[PDB]
């Protein structure tokens, strides 16, 4: 027998960073019958084919309005093979607070004996000329913790598909060459 290959990715970060915009931007290609199959659930599914004709379904979880201490947060983070730490490049506190989001991820990782792929996602790159987190500051946070680095715009779609695709590939031990 052979079963579906599914990877769970959770999207974390402070309110107003663009988490729901980001997840929706990636979900849009599935709108119609497939997205409707999980309407009102905690996640949606999107199938991608990674290089080498590797079919995988991504199960993408938006935490909604959950805060760091939310007692529902566990179902989002436990089992997550990929984690997006999302901030708004124009909102400094959203970046600073990612240390605290990452503390929860480390705690879950240690308990679960897992090593999820963690991506730092600077959203709103369409607003680059008004950013309050410089690229160098973002890349320092990535270097300190081994995060995958992404600058995206959920509004316009810039780099969004590639962020999820790269995270999926890295979960499976593949560095995509582009």
Residue 132 found at the interface with Mg ion (CB under 5 A): no
What is the distance between the terminal CA atoms of the chain, rounded to a whole angstrom? 34
- Report strand pairing: 54-62 vs 43-50: antiparallel
* Binding residues among 33-92 for Mg ion as defined by CB under 5 A: none
**Is 155 a known ligand-binding residue?**
yes
Using the contact rule CB under 6 A, the part of the chain among 11-19, 112-120, 136-144, 167-175 near ligand G3D is 11-19
> How far apart are the C-alpha atoms of 58 and 12, rounded to whole Å?
16
DSSP-assigned beta bridge partners for residue 86: 121
For 43, 107, 140, the CA distances from 75, given in Å and listed in that order, are 11, 14, 30
Question: What is the size of the binding site for ligand G3D (CB under 6 A)?
Answer: 14
Q: Which of 3, 10, 20, 108 binds Mg ion (CB under 5 A)?
A: 20
Q: Which is nearer to ligand G3D, 8 or 124 (CB)?
A: 124
3-state secondary structure of 10: strand
Binding mask 101-140 for ligand G3D (x = CB under 6 A): ----------------------xx-xx-------------
């Amino acid at each position: 027998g052979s079963h579906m290959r599914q990877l769970k990715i959770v999207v974390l970060g402070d309110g107003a960073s663009g988490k729901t915009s980001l997840t929706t931007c990636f979900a849009q290609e599935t709108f119609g019958k497939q997205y409707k199959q999980t309407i009102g659930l905690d996640f949606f599914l999107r199938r991608i084919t990674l290089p080498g004709n590797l079919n995988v379904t991504l199960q993408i979880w938006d935490i909604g309005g959950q805060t760091i201490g939310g007692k529902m947060l566990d179902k989002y983070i436990y089992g997550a093979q990929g984690v997006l730490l999302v901030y708004d490049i124009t909102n400094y506190q959203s970046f600073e607070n990612l240390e605290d989001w990452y503390t929860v991820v480390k705690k879950v990782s240690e308990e679960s004996e897992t090593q999820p792929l963690v991506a730092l996602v600077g959203n709103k790159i369409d607003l680059e000329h008004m950013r309050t987190i410089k690229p160098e500051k973002h890349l320092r946070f990535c270097q300190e913790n081994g995060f995958s680095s992404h600058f995206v715009s959920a509004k316009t779609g810039d780099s969004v598909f590639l962020c999820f695709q790269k995270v999926a590939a890295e979960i499976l031990g593949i560095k995509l060459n582009k």
